Amino acid sequence: SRHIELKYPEVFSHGSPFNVPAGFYPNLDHVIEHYRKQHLEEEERKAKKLAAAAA
Amino acid sequence: PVPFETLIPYGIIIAMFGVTGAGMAKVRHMFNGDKRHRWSVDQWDKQQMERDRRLTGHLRGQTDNPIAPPGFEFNNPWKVXXXXX
Amino acid sequence: MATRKPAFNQHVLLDTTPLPDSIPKVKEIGASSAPLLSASFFIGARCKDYNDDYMQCKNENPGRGEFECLKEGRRVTRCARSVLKDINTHCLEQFRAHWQCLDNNNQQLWQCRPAEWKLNKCVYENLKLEKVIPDQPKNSTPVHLRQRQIFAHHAIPPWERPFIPGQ
Amino acid sequence: WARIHLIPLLQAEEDRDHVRRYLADQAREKGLLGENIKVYNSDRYVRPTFAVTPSKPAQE
Amino acid sequence: MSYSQTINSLVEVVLVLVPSLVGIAYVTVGERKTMGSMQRRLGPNAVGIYGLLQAFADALKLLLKEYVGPTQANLVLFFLGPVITLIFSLLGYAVIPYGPGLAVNDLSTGILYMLAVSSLATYGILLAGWSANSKYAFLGSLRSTAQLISYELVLSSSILLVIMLSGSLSLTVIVESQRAIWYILPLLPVFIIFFIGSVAETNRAPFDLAEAESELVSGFMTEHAAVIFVFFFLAEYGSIVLMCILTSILFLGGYLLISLLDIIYNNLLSWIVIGKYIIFIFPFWGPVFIDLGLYEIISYLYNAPTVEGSFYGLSLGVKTSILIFVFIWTRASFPRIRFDQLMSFCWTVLLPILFALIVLVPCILYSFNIFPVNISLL
Amino acid sequence: MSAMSIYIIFVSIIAILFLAIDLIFAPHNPYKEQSRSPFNISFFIYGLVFLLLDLEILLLYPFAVSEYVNSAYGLAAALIFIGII
Amino acid sequence: TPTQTYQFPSKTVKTDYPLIDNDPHFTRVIRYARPSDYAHGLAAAAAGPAALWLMERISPSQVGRGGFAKAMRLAGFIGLAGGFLYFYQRSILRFYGMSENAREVEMDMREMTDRVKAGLPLYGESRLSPAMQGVAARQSRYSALFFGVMPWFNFVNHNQHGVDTAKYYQQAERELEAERLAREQA
Amino acid sequence: TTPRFWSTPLKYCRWAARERPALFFSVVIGALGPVTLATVPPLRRLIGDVDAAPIPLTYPIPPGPRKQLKGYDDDTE
Amino acid sequence: ASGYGLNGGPSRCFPFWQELLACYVTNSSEDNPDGKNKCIPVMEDYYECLHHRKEAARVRALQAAYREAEAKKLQENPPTAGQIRNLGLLNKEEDTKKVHCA
Amino acid sequence: SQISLLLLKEIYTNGSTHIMLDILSVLAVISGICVIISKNPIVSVLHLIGLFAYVSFYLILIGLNFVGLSYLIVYIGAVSILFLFILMLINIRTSELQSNTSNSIPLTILVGIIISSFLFKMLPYGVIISKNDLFFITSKIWDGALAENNHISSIGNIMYTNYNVWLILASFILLLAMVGAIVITIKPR
Amino acid sequence: NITLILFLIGILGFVLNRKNIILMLISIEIMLLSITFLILLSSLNMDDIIGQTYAIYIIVVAGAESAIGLGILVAFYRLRGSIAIEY
Ligand SMILES: CCCCCCCCCCCCO[C@@H]1O[C@H](CO)[C@@H](O[C@H]2O[C@H](CO)[C@@H](O)[C@H](O)[C@H]2O)[C@H](O)[C@H]1O
Ligand SMILES: CCCCCCCCCCCCO[C@@H]1O[C@H](CO)[C@@H](O[C@H]2O[C@H](CO)[C@@H](O)[C@H](O)[C@H]2O)[C@H](O)[C@H]1O
Ligand SMILES: CCCCCCCCCCCCO[C@@H]1O[C@H](CO)[C@@H](O[C@H]2O[C@H](CO)[C@@H](O)[C@H](O)[C@H]2O)[C@H](O)[C@H]1O
Ligand SMILES: CCCCCCCCCCCCO[C@@H]1O[C@H](CO)[C@@H](O[C@H]2O[C@H](CO)[C@@H](O)[C@H](O)[C@H]2O)[C@H](O)[C@H]1O
């Protein structure tokens, strides 16, 4: 593997909630859609695995 | 009976504490433009006084005019330092 | 320039270069620090939409919001100039009474309640604007309306009444 | 809440000044060196950390 | 600003140091006069009209005395040592507020400043005792250092409990927060522990037996070194006065006078524009206060910057003096405690109670929604 | 200049002057004219128990000036830290 | 529908069974525990005290009069400690998807849907700030996996649980549309 | 003479209150903190003492799309 | 990188770090080896924010141009500090006109 | 027409001289030299108390009061005191600790060059930031100055919540230094 | 640059020491004061509070090594009667 997968993807939710200047934090919905797709694909694989092998 | 002689030194100490607070409140009053001095000042209060200097020239100066005078746009002070950062 | 607090600053650098003619000019707010605090709750009664739009435009465009949000900032400084203009037109005496109080009170609001209540009376009558502090507790009197202020250095005389809009 | 109703007016004045001094420095560079040097590979405005200053202050 | 900063810097520093120094001199006269009334005698009453010059002659005598301490193998230590012990004594006064913000340095970490200057006290008791040459006495300087470090934990751990209530380390904010109530009332047992810890910290009697035993084992060949030096005496008296002002800042009002102008407002209800000032009370009548002569003058003097500052400092002074009495009264009331017994008091009684209260206090402040805001308010 | 600077220098001047009266005015005579015992271990224990508890209370001072934000979650962690020490 | 069911980036772990929650609340963990979970916790808990008594009989300590009673107390606390951690860790791995959890997926689907139709916040109401809720959630997500070294439990009502909550809302919608037709029919 | 906690729990507690008071009441006070957390807060919500809302420590940006304001434009200047 | 600054607010170079984390996580995978090559300029900006070497280099030539460009041109009347300190003040219009050469 | 950039002094809201940092560096170096050359270990610990003070002031001078005061409370307050206790009770013959220092001058010369030449390249640009000289520039902000916190409140906002695992390990390190140091010194009972 | 020099001082305390096991105790703490001091000055440069906190935990571990170090040195002295190294 030359690719690193973050063990803590929750560092995208890090950052002080106080004295925040407008525009300081970046628009990271492209990131949240990545992780949403990853959770939905993994839910599907197991779904497709323990439902097609339970019959 | 009351031994007021032993009580004389204590009254001296109370008079000294009185003179420090008396004399320090007045020197600050005059220093601050014959107005009461500011106390628990944060970054916001200090910058607010800096913009007071911009409008009037005095850090304690106050003006209620709705329009800023000409030149106000360029008098915004950007501080310069040699070392720390 | 950087937002870092300075420790060894000894000089100021001024740039006399003017803003370009492409950007529409706006007359700037000229009220000092204490006049602004006296009129602070009036401004957010009227310009809250403009004040919130300006902060939203900047949030919408990260890292590029000083530019690209310039029209909105001019809208906020015109809304606030109209409040400062309106207060001088009708409540000048009560306004100056309150902000000159705050000058000698560490600009602490609880230290000038008798002056504030009179200004709130005059601004509500003349400009129909009202001081509102959002999300205040529900089981007690609002702090800005209490007959007694615990942290006041001088006691509020009992005949000085808090201004309730309608009594 | 009293500092909130003032934060947008005070910021707006600072933002016009940040645009003024940034546009002025870009122009001051184009004449002096003939072009602009790009310090970041993004359109983000970074608040300057260094400034070009005169070699001397006012006489005072 | 109206005039130059250096002038303003100089006037405030002189206005704090010269009254503080004159006061530290009268605590020495006062402790001999108070102990004499309680011992049915007189204090000094001859050097000066009422003995008011006793401190002056004592100090000038020592200054003129020969000093025969070892200058060999240590020249700086003999001379430049105790000098900065006196600096570490006066450096704590630069954060005392004589009214809101009326301090030399208004410091947000003002409390952590006075915790730093206090840990330097241990050096002025360790190093001076290093000069005396007698085996048992040297171990008595280590035992005095051990008492100071132990009773410093008492003070710092109990200062912590005040900070939880105030939310700030600024002495001004800590006093302003007591406008609601003095901290002696809700933190009663913390105050007593602090005052007892503050006597033990100053090495004062009844906690002075370690440094007391040096004079009993000196022998027939060697002697002490604190001899002609007024430094370690001004360092001592000034640390007692400073432990009284800080004790008042934290638990008594600080500079807070209980204002009677609130009471008169509640009682008086017959406001009259003719200047009569009738009162709606049972002992009341129609007063004849002169509007032209008195009321106009009295109202102006009350709002004067000099008068209001004066009362703020007379309040802090009256409260410090009451505590100076309680230190002198304590020395005249008790015998001495042995070093092991004071150590047991600190480590097996006081500190266990303090750590029990360190748990309980923030737990109650959470239970009654009373955690203060830690932003700059007040 | 700042006030804290002028204050230390002032005290420094006074502390020097009392040396000057002593070294100027007090008389000065030129003539300025080995065993082992175990030390008690309790001296070591006094310094050590102080050193650790003093570091421990130091770690709690940030909590007392950050209570409102810390709230229940911060309290629980600090209670755990208080409990261990 | 809140228009955003996946609101926070979360770690996907490769496991053999469906995830119900990254960070189940303590009461949900207790409430879903199957009766076998109780047998196993009690069985492990008694083991440390019984191991210690077994050792004393087979290889006596030769200790004084009260020493074994003191040790029995300590071995007993460790048994209640390890016993409860094992019982909790056995229930919470079905939430994580690291144990067969067909039963608890149904119990989860019912309750979470029954909450939606009641208008309730899906994961309850937190007295803590949205930011302190996010700190709490990052601390407790998959933390029963570190129990052998450090104990941690969720006692906060955050809404960050690693799951796309569209399904609970979808099933509530399909269940509401089923009941409405029945009422209209009769 | 002095009792044993695990033989006579109540009898030890009286001796410790009488013979080791600073130590005994330290453990008592330390336990009151854990109790006060458990007890007062539910009783407070019974009597209706609602906890105050948190104070703002950042600019309070409202959620949703921008409102499309009209007013205070360059022409008005 | 932490997100927490000295004044209680966020850290100055935290936006650049998230812009760099977002780039790497959404452009580089095991399917595509070079996707992380879009993170190169994004990583440079992060290293620039923390250290300020390229800005220091830029402002060190521009300052050398201006200082010898304003060292040889004719000076008419340099405004004194007291004049600058009265700029924009409501009763010193004469000084402001001198400063802005209008 | 006139120079657009204008540089003038600050009359009241000024700041500190950067000269003091160069002084406090010199004494810290001077104090540190005397630590590792002093014959008597008592004196070396005193030169250490001096070095800790100069570094403490250096930090206070650049804005880091809580940690600069923490260094004062912790090192000079308590660590050097424990060092003084032990060093004033252990019997020390000051000539048995004295080694021929003149031999190690060449190895001092060699290791000084090699370490200095390598490690200095590793430091970042901001630390070695200190003839056209670059000036650092600062300006005000309003949204970020609403409720500013002192450094200790900012450390506290995160020390007990987000990074609380660091508090757990430290609690256990201090707890081990209690049990372990008591158990290796005292005679039980 | 001061941080690196003060690091050298701690190193050079190990270069010049044939007899002082106390100066070996001392120089370890000079080295710790360099590394903590470097972390702190870079934290001011990047506006990060984590550098400040990391300094705090270095200071707390540094004091704990002094307790363990002076405790072990006491245990050694009790049976030795000398901290000296015969050479
Ligand atoms: C002005 C700055 C300081 C310069 C030096 C000033 C003098 C300092 C020493 C005098 C101050 C008071 O110091 C204190 O004096 C009293 C006498 O009154 C002494 O007291 C001594 O005599 C009294 C006489 O009744 C006895 O009760 C007591 O048992 C005995 O110890 C104390 O032992 C001494 O500590
Ligand atoms: C917890 C916050 C604390 C805030 C206040 C901190 C104040 C610290 C001031 C320290 C000044 C020096 O501290 C003080 O020094 C003197 C001289 O060494 C000591 O005094 C010592 O010498 C005198 C004689 O000259 C003896 O009578 C005394 O018994 C002896 O202990 C005091 O015991 C000590 O308290
Ligand atoms: C730090 C600020 C600068 C320094 C300020 C203080 C200066 C001090 C030096 C000047 C005063 C010297 O003080 C004086 O010294 C001399 C010499 O030691 C002493 O002189 C004594 O010893 C000498 C030895 O040669 C004898 O010959 C002489 O007859 C005898 O009186 C005096 O008794 C003392 O009073
Ligand atoms: C000389 C080499 C030394 C190596 C030291 C380390 C050896 C580690 C051996 C243990 C490996 C894991 O062993 C594992 O334990 C868990 C305990 O619940 C069980 O694993 C089981 O877990 C849960 C139930 O709890 C089931 O949902 C899962 O399907 C099943 O695998 C099995 O017993 C075994 O698969």
CA C62 – CA J143 distance, rounded (Å)? 15
Q: Do G133 and G8 meet the contact criterion of CB atoms below 8 Å apart?
A: no
Backbone angles phi, psi at E176, to 5 degrees: -60, -30
Which structural domain range is residue J111 located in? 18-184
CA E14 – CA B13 distance, rounded (Å)? 16
CB contact under 8 A, A10 and G11: yes
Ligand 2 atom with least separation from CA of E243:
5
How many domains, in total, are found in chain J? 1
Q: Other CB atoms closer than 10 Å to residue C70's CB: what's the count? A: 18
CATH number at residue J43: 1.20.120.1200
Is J169 in CB contact (< 8 Å) with chain I? Answer: no
Resolution to 1 decimal place, in Å = 2.8
Which structural domain range is residue F24 located in? 3-85
Query: What is the distance of C-alpha J56 from the center of its chain?
Result: 6
| D3, D13, D51 member nearest B80 (Cβ) | D51
Q: Other CB atoms closer than 10 Å to residue C46's CB: what's the count? A: 18
Q: Residue E209: CA atoms inside 13 Å, Cβ hemisphere, count?
A: 12
CATH number at residue K57: 1.10.287.3510
Q: Do B83 and J21 meet the contact criterion of CB atoms below 8 Å apart?
A: yes
Q: Which residue of E has its CA nearest to H42?
A: E367
Report yes or no on K59 lying in a domain: yes
Q: Which chains touch J (3 or more CB pairs under 8 A)?
A: A, B, C, D, E, F, G, H, I, K
User: J8: which strand partners?
Assistant: C12
Q: Which residue of A has its CA nearest to H55?
A: A18
> CA torsion E225→E227→E231→E236, rounded to 10°?
90
- What is the CA(G42)–ligand 4 centre distance, in A? 20
Q: Which residue of A has its CA nearest to C51?
A: A22
Ligand 4 atom with least separation from CA of G98:
27
Q: Which of E214, E230, E236 to mutate to test the pocket of ligand 2 (most atoms within 8 A of CB)?
A: E236
Q: Give the closest ligand to the alpha carbon of residue E243.
A: 2
Burial classification of residue G149, based on how many CB atoms lie within 10 Å of its CB (0-12 exposed, 13-18 middle, 19 or more buried): exposed
Q: Extract the tokens encoding J53.
A: 């003070």
CA A18 – CA J146 distance, rounded (Å)? 9
Least Cα separation, residue K11 to chain I (angstroms): 28
CB contact under 8 A, I100 and B54: no
CA nearest neighbour of A42 among C63, E328, G6, E317: G6
CB contact under 8 A, E255 and B29: no
How many Cβ pairs closer than 8 A exist between chain B and C? 103
Hey, is E6 helix, strand or coil? helix
* Amino acid found at E46: A
What is the 8-class DSSP label of residue H18? Answer: H
Report yes or no on K27 lying in a domain: yes
CA J167 – CA J175 distance, rounded (Å)? 12
CB contact under 8 A, C2 and I87: no
List helix spans (H) across E221-348: 231-250, 261-267, 296-302, 305-333, 339-344
CA distances from J160 to A18, E255, J91, J163, J165 (A): 17, 34, 44, 7, 9
What is the 8-class DSSP label of residue E40? Answer: T
DSSP labels, chain C: -B-SPPSS--EEEEE-PPPPTTSPP-PPB---HHHHHHTHHHHHHHSHHHHHHHHHHHHHSTT--SSS-HHHHHHHHHHHHHHHHHHHHHHHHHHHHHHHHHHTTTT-GGG-HHHHHHHHHHHHHHH------TT--SSS--GGG-S--TT-SSPPPTTS----S--
Give the C window 94-153 contacts with J, CB below 8 Å: none
- Do the two chains F and C touch, given a threshold of 8 Å on CB pairs and at least 3 pairs? no
Least Cα separation, residue C142 to chain A (angstroms): 25
CA K87 – CA E132 distance, rounded (Å)? 34
How many domains, in total, are found in chain K? 1
Residues of chain G neighbouring J162 (CB-CB closer than 8 A): 135, 138
Residue with CA nearest ligand 3 atom 12: F24
How many domains, in total, are found in chain F? 1
CB contact under 8 A, G132 and J161: yes
Is the shortest distance between the CB of G40 and ligand 4 below 6 Å?
no
CA H77 – CA C77 distance, rounded (Å)? 10
Q: Spell out a b/e string for E188-208, using b for 16 or more CB atoms within 10 Å of the CB, else e.
A: eebbebbbbbbbbbbbbbebb
Place of tokens 């979970």: G37
Is B2 in CB contact (< 8 Å) with chain E? Answer: no
Mutate to test the interface with K, among B43, B81, B83, B85 (most CBs of K within 10 A): B85
CB contact under 8 A, K30 and J91: no
How many Cβ pairs closer than 8 A exist between chain B and K? 3
How many domains, in total, are found in chain C? 1
Q: Residue C145: CA atoms inside 13 Å, Cβ hemisphere, count?
A: 14
Hey, is E118 helix, strand or coil? helix
CB contact under 8 A, E149 and J78: yes
CA nearest neighbour of E201 among E124, E257, E253, E277: E124
CB contact under 8 A, C50 and H69: yes
CA K23 – CA J45 distance, rounded (Å)? 9
Residues of chain D neighbouring B80 (CB-CB closer than 8 A): 51, 53
Technique employed here was: cryo-EM
Is J171 in CB contact (< 8 Å) with chain G? Answer: no
Q: Do G95 and G20 meet the contact criterion of CB atoms below 8 Å apart?
A: yes
Which structural domain range is residue K74 located in? 1-80
Least Cα separation, residue H58 to chain J (angstroms): 7
- What is the CA(E29)–ligand 1 centre distance, in A? 9
| F2, F55, F77 member nearest J160 (Cβ) | F77
Q: Extract the tokens encoding E155.
A: 């003070």
Report yes or no on K87 lying in a domain: no
Hey, is K51 helix, strand or coil? helix
CA F43 – CA J86 distance, rounded (Å)? 8
CB contact under 8 A, H57 and A19: yes
Question: In which element (H, E) is residue J98 found?
Answer: none
Ligand 3 atom with least separation from CA of F24:
11
User: B79: which strand partners?
Assistant: C12, J138
Helix then strand then coil, in percent of chain J rounded to 5, is 60, 5, 35
